[PDB]
Design an enzyme around this catalytic site. Structure first.
Site, PDB file in Angstrom:
ATOM      1  N   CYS A   1      11.891  18.093 -53.333  1.00 32.25           N
ATOM      2  CA  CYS A   1      12.141  19.534 -53.423  1.00 32.25           C
ATOM      3  C   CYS A   1      13.821  19.542 -53.134  1.00 32.25           C
ATOM      4  O   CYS A   1      14.322  19.181 -52.392  1.00 32.25           O
ATOM      5  CB  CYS A   1      11.312  20.223 -52.239  1.00 32.25           C
ATOM      6  SG  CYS A   1       9.429  19.783 -52.072  1.00 32.25           S
TER       7      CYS A   1
ATOM      8  N   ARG B   1      13.227  27.399 -55.752  1.00 32.60           N
ATOM      9  CA  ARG B   1      13.200  25.919 -55.193  1.00 32.60           C
ATOM     10  C   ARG B   1      12.633  25.141 -56.252  1.00 32.60           C
ATOM     11  O   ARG B   1      11.998  25.628 -57.293  1.00 32.60           O
ATOM     12  CB  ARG B   1      12.233  25.766 -54.231  1.00 32.60           C
ATOM     13  CG  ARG B   1      10.999  26.218 -54.159  1.00 32.60           C
ATOM     14  CD  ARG B   1       9.818  25.325 -54.785  1.00 32.60           C
ATOM     15  NE  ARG B   1       9.618  24.303 -53.907  1.00 32.60           N
ATOM     16  CZ  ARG B   1       8.907  24.360 -52.787  1.00 32.60           C
ATOM     17  NH1 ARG B   1       8.454  25.547 -52.477  1.00 32.60           N
ATOM     18  NH2 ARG B   1       8.893  23.179 -52.208  1.00 32.60           N
TER      19      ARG B   1
ATOM     20  N   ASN C   1       9.007  19.810 -48.304  1.00 33.14           N
ATOM     21  CA  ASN C   1       8.699  18.198 -47.653  1.00 33.14           C
ATOM     22  C   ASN C   1       9.793  17.916 -46.707  1.00 33.14           C
ATOM     23  O   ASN C   1      11.136  17.827 -46.922  1.00 33.14           O
ATOM     24  CB  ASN C   1       8.408  17.319 -48.588  1.00 33.14           C
ATOM     25  CG  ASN C   1       7.629  16.258 -48.309  1.00 33.14           C
ATOM     26  OD1 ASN C   1       6.485  16.291 -47.414  1.00 33.14           O
ATOM     27  ND2 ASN C   1       7.895  14.873 -48.553  1.00 33.14           N
TER      28      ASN C   1
END
Lengths: 328, 328, 328, 328
Positions: C1, C17, C81
């Protein structure tokens, strides 16, 4: 600067460092016998050695201060540059064992016989501020320390606390903090010491041009971060593949790879940053080995050849005259 | 292997190399006086030296063969591994000066006094490989040739022709071809020897953690391509910044950076590829300096201390026993 | 990410994102009106929204949970994450504001109108453990959060405490900790956005082969560390050189550079890790823009076109059907 | 510029490129029916198309010139910048088929139906540069040529000869020569698409921080050499791991990774070098797909929807206005 600990094929423990600076600091090899009283004239603080000490340092107003060294018990310590993330106290902190920056190395070697003993006392960890003579710019250093058990620690004082890290890598460089470098090692898990000879790129056969293809991606510059990576993996490869070949010269081969060369690492004051000397201490034998930028032949000073119960500090001239073997 | 040419502060010319192999080849230092007839017993081909020769090599059936060396006129030659893009002829080519691989180095040093003289003769040198004894072929070796004028050439035989390149970089490694490496240098025009202390990343202040930030991106592995880049720029930096400091030991500092360390460059036969020795020839003085993986002290053999009009080949034992200076 | 915040030429704030995963999580675009009671059936915990919310998430037993999103006040949040250095509590901690992992994102957007307001409540920072339904593996995430003032924070819970960092870089990726990545940026102070056309390498002229020589040394892989470096400097360069050109599509150009491609990032379960979608929230306008791996056309959902005082959750199907403009 | 050839899961062949320039060249999509006479007014040279042509280009004095395109037979051609190692002739060479730089692309597509047919004709193509109007020369452009058989060639004219390389990599960028890039690929045989999760560094456990550790060492900058490496391996990985998933959008994902972003690749005239557009030609279907820096939605022009036996050139406006799907 680069620090390194290594175990030889005969089970002996080597500990040493590259000193990377752009100047001279009037260094010499200093021997101090045991039960010797050192007194700083500027601040009247005194220290009486419990153990005999040998290493590289310099003397200010008859007071010795060390860059690296060992004691008679096989404890070693090295002080490496740590410019960004260090924070000493400006004066003594109440209830703590307050150690002046310049005196930290001698404090370790004069008083303690093992890493475990140093660890307990550092809990106690205090790299505050205090001068030595009258002036001089009291800097910083990120500490480790290694002994005959093969175990090493790293000592770093930050704004919050005096940190003592167990060092399972066997190396140290400079800034940033030790935990940063250890996490950075994880980026390089894909490195391989073994030759990768070929790669089938679909319809194209790719074949290695020469040896060393497994380590492509290893950083080649002279920053503290890059040197940390190189020395960590070079040390690992030799232990994994050649544990039974490790001797004195192997220590120097590893540190040579991360040594600074004249001309290519220039400071903002336009001076060349060099690996001025490389030291290697054989901890069980009490021998300080070193060479210099000017003279690559290894010089040995054995503390056991001195009187350990003597009453004088002894110094040995820093050897910067190239020694050649004239064969014919 | 890495070849290097350098000019000292006193205007003397150094030429030498790292030998990077995973085995021993029964090498010794070989001296051959002038007007000396060498005869290969296996193929009855003969060579009479015009000039006295000194260098590293080995002797097969009384016939000498060299890995690197110099002559009394200040001409130097070094044979480096060249495994991929080489192509020797299987037999002699008509009308050409056919030189057997194993004999190329001796052919250069025995016959010619300068790079210019070698250049003219090479217009025609068919590396037709042919043994000189038993069935142990030659090498991927490419040759760097340099003399007292400071000029160097690179000799490479491909499938199409014998290439002779002017070498303005002052270095050589291994595969691929010389023109590939020269073009590869263009990828690194953004390197800087001077410290970059800070970078304003918008709202974030970025400050250099230590010395060396200008060279980030320099490759750190031990492949021929990476070593070529490192030695090219390290040499450039010292000439640019420290022309007047260049002496013998500086040559060794440069080559140490690209030296192979035990354990980390493993072949497919699981042997460690090492920098077995490093030679440095002072061409004006006729002195062959060298150290080895086992013994880092520099050893000097001066051909002018021998009888140049002698009638015997002389050899000197390859020194692989660590020589330490015991100070106390 | 990879997370990113950017200010447009018209002074509007974009926040979004890349979602990098190897699987689907039944995601859809979720709209929640204000004053809406959400009740988790498995643990009977309830939440009534103060502000209307829009973003990407999924629904477990009628309970919504978000991967990223924004509220009607222009506050945005994204959960990325954070596998290694995270540590949630196994149960509630006394005296703290305990937030279940799955509910953190909704907790931020439902309750607060600004970064400053979130900051005070996080002091309070508690990403402990708590399930949602009956099972499911409650993971981790390293938090930031951004608003219409242009300021961003990063939220990370470690074994010692809930850390809230001011984010002056404008980006986030994955492990290690935020302070590690910020220090890592210092390694790259030597990078230059401007072309370096030539380099005089002594006797050899080096000329750039093409554009981009100033950025040689920028890491090209898809690790969190490398992607952090790339996005930080790409963002910096556009603000420095092209502040007045910044609009919606520029956000996507930056994130495309660090997007994962099918085939080249394989997990140990031999699945391809992909940039599954890219979201961009225009905070002042309440518009959620996104595209997907399958469909690169940007889709817009405007919360202001919904009834903010409604009584139903609304969802929009995740668009993975490529949309082409047929010109003729 | 970056060229790419790919085969879809349904066995169709895609061929296209990124156009990387810092300026506009009044480009539009150009369709030319078969049996159409093009006449250059400045030099009175004429060309009558044998096959209908479609692609990106511009029109000078009613004369069309192409940057990339395809014909009705499924032959594709793309002209990429080639600034350093190119050498056109200043005038026609006797006995050769002399092709003006600006006319090369149209010459290929108008006359030939396959790569094999082009190959035979090229045995002889002297890129003697000669204008077609005013005094605005040609490009450093090198040409990638591909067809429905899946085979590609690379065409490069140097000072010595017109080189035609078989392209087994499936990619092309810019300078240096094609053989340089192919040899450069050998440096990266140690790259792995599969996750390396851990590394036992003696007493220290090293664990991957995130996905992607096998590709550490992949260069991340925007130079022609780095982009060549990236696209070569990204293409390889998708074919090896995901042959049966390959479709139109995958082509764009690969080229996005090597696309230039505003602000970070600045020329010496201080302009931003951008990936202005990305084209993808489906050779069997006669469809030219493209998007632009300003508008990422893919636009399709199908030549089979035109009259192939028409009597007019048709143009389509270059689309640089962002096309958004408004969901609600």
């Amino acid at each position: 600067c680069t620090g390194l600990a290594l175990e030889t094929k005969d089970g002996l423990h080597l500990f040493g460092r590259n000193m990377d600076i752009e100047y001279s600091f009037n260094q010499s090899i200093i021997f101090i016998p045991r039960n010797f009283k050192c007194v700083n004239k500027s601040n009247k603080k005194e220290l009486t050695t419990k153990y005999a000490v040998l290493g590289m340092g310099t003397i200010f107003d008859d007071y010795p201060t060390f860059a690296d060294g060992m004691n008679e018990k096989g404890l070693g310590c090295a002080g490496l540059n740590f410019p960004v993330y260090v924070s000493y106290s400006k004066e003594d902190i109440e209830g703590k064992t307050n150690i002046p920056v310049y005196n930290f190395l001698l404090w370790v070697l004069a008083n303690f016989s093992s890493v475990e003993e140093v660890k307990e006392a550092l809990k106690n960890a205090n790299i505050v501020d205090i001068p030595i003579s009258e002036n001089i710019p009291n800097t910083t250093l990120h500490w480790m320390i290694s002994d005959i058990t093969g175990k090493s620690i790293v000592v770093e004082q930050t704004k919050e606390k005096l940190n003592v890290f167990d060092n399972n890598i066997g190396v140290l460089t400079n800034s940033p903090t030790f935990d940063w470098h250890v996490a950075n090692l994880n980026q390089y898990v894909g490195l391989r010491y073994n030759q990768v000879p070929e790669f089938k790129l679909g319809d194209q056969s790719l074949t290695a041009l020469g040896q060393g293809t497994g380590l492509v991606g290893l950083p080649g510059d002279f920053t503290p971060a890059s040197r940390f990576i190189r020395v960590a993996f070079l040390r690992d490869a030799m232990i994994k593949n050649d544990k039974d070949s490790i001797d004195l010269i192997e220590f120097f081969h590893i540190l040579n790879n991360v040594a600074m060369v004249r001309g290519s690492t220039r400071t903002v004051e336009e001076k060349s940053d060099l690996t001025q000397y490389t030291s290697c201490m054989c901890l069980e034998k009490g021998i300080y080995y070193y060479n210099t930028y000017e003279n690559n032949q290894i010089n040995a000073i054995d503390m056991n050849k001195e009187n350990l119960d003597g009453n004088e500090i002894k110094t040995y001239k820093y050897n910067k005259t190239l020694s050649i073997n004239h064969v014919n």
